[PDB]
């Protein structure tokens, strides 16, 4: 079995072997990456996604998320409190602020230290979840606005058409801004690459062990598991590093760099920070080997996790006992 102990692999594509994304993603699992639930790939050298970001400020964040954290500082929710509208310019222009800026730091592993010392006792603005793209048309390769659909995908697989669309989003970070524990929806994959900025820190419990981790999050955060059977679907939970040492729960962590794309593999459990500024473009994507996850995926029919109109397809097609119920909790 290749990569046994679930390490997060790292690659290094040849310029020759980006242009072909469904074999490189096929490659990357025969040498196990998917064991880890995240892998980073470090495009060739002769690769750029777009020419400059040097126009980029007119972009608007029409609701930035203020993240008000409750809790204790390894083992917290956090809430999204809507703002008022502003651009990519003032945004970062805010990031930059005083109250907001990254402080000094010796180096990444510091920071991370003053991220789960500290991260509670603020509350950073996310400017999360805008439809859009920052590749240039004209890049061919690993373009996240030109992959294969998931609803082609399983019209491949299963014959069957469906309705929906799959479209990018782009993510503007500031310090501290952070990602609750979440697998993809309908346990897909997802591919995230950090256009510009500040690096952002990533945790990962390998697929195998998905099932740890939701245990102690029911121990962890009793009333919302009460709830709902489905509770991380909310994407409000934080549990930090020095937390699951404690409890056993099997997890790797690694820093994307600005230029580099991370993939999240299907049922695999992610969390993390931003270091400051930052603008990511992310999107989910299926291959051949997601149909058995969405199959099984679990579902929010409490109502909180409320989500995309192309769900409904999934669900209905691949989860039919599921659908009525799921389908309540959307309506
Ligand atoms: O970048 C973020 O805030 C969150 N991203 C993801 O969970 C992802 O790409 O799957
Ligand atoms: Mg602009
Ligand atoms: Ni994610
Ligand atoms: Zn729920």
Same mark, same amino acid.
Request: net charge neutral; glycine share 8%.
């Given at each position: 079995?290749?990569?046994?102990?679930?390490?997060?692999?790292?690659?290094?594509?040849?310029?020759?072997?980006?242009?072909?994304? &469904?074999?490189?993603? +096929?490659?990357? =699992?025969?040498?196990?990456?998917?064991?880890?639930?995240?892998?980073? #790939?470090?495009?060739?050298?002769?690769?750029?996604?777009?020419?400059?970001?040097?126009?980029?400020?007119?972009?608007?964040?029409?609701?930035?998320?203020?993240?008000? +954290?409750?809790?204790?500082?390894?083992?917290?929710?956090?809430?999204?409190?809507?703002?008022?509208?502003?651009?990519?310019?003032?945004?970062?222009?805010?990031?930059?602020?005083?109250?907001?800026?990254?402080?000094?730091?010796?180096? %990444?592993?510091?920071? =991370?230290?003053?991220?789960?010392? *500290?991260?509670?006792?603020?509350?950073? #603005?996310?400017?999360?979840?805008?439809?859009?793209?920052?590749?240039?048309?004209?890049?061919?390769?690993?373009?996240?606005? !030109?992959?294969?659909?998931?609803? &082609?995908?399983?019209?491949? =697989?299963?014959?069957?058409?469906?309705?929906?669309?799959?479209?990018?989003?782009?993510?503007?970070?500031?310090?501290?801004?952070?990602?609750?524990?979440?697998?993809?929806?309908?346990?897909?994959?997802?591919?995230?690459?950090? !256009?510009?900025?500040?690096?952002?820190?990533?945790?990962?419990?390998?697929?195998?062990?998905?099932?740890?981790?939701?245990?102690?999050?029911? @121990?962890?955060?009793?009333?919302?598991?009460?709830?709902?059977?489905?509770?991380?679907?909310?994407?409000?939970?934080?549990?930090?590093?020095?937390?699951?040492?404690?409890?056993?729960?099997? %997890?790797?962590?690694?820093?994307? @760099?600005?230029?580099?794309?991370?993939?999240?593999?299907?049922?695999?459990? !992610?969390?993390? %920070? *931003?270091?400051?500024? *930052?603008?990511? =473009?992310?999107?989910?994507?299926?291959?051949?080997?997601?149909?058995?996850?969405?199959?099984?995926?679990?579902?929010?029919?409490?109502? @909180?996790?409320?989500?995309?109109?192309?769900?409904?397809?999934?669900?209905?097609?691949?989860?039919?006992?599921?659908? &009525?119920?799921?389908?309540?909790?959307?309506?």
């Amino acid at each position: 079995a290749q990569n046994p102990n679930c390490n997060i692999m790292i690659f290094h594509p040849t310029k020759e072997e980006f242009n072909d994304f &469904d074999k490189y993603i +096929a490659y990357m =699992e025969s040498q196990g990456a998917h064991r880890a639930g995240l892998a980073k #790939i470090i495009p060739p050298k002769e690769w750029k996604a777009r020419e400059t970001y040097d126009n980029i400020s007119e972009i608007l964040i029409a609701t930035p998320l203020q993240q008000v +954290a409750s809790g204790r500082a390894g083992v917290f929710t956090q809430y999204h409190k809507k703002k008022k509208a502003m651009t990519v310019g003032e945004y970062r222009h805010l990031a930059n602020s005083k109250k907001y800026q990254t402080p000094p730091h010796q180096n %990444f592993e510091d920071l =991370e230290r003053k991220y789960w010392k *500290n991260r509670i006792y603020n509350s950073p #603005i996310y400017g999360a979840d805008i439809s859009g793209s920052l590749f240039d048309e004209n890049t061919k390769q690993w373009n996240l606005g !030109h992959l294969g659909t998931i609803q &082609d995908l399983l019209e491949k =697989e299963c014959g069957v058409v469906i309705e929906g669309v799959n479209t990018p989003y782009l993510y503007f970070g500031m310090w501290k801004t952070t990602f609750a524990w979440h697998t993809e929806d309908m346990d897909l994959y997802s591919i995230n690459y950090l !256009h510009l900025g500040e690096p952002k820190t990533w945790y990962v419990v390998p697929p195998e062990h998905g099932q740890r981790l939701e245990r102690l999050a029911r @121990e962890l955060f009793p009333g919302s598991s009460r709830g709902c059977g489905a509770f991380l679907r909310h994407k409000v939970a934080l549990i930090s590093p020095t937390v699951l040492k404690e409890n056993g729960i099997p %997890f790797n962590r690694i820093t994307q @760099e600005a230029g580099e794309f991370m993939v999240t593999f299907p049922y695999g459990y !992610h969390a993390g %920070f *931003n270091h400051g500024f *930052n603008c990511a =473009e992310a999107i989910n994507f299926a291959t051949p080997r997601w149909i058995d996850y969405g199959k099984m995926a679990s579902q929010c029919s409490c109502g @909180e996790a409320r989500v995309t109109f192309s769900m409904d397809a999934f669900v209905r097609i691949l989860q039919p006992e599921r659908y &009525d119920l799921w389908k309540r909790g959307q309506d």
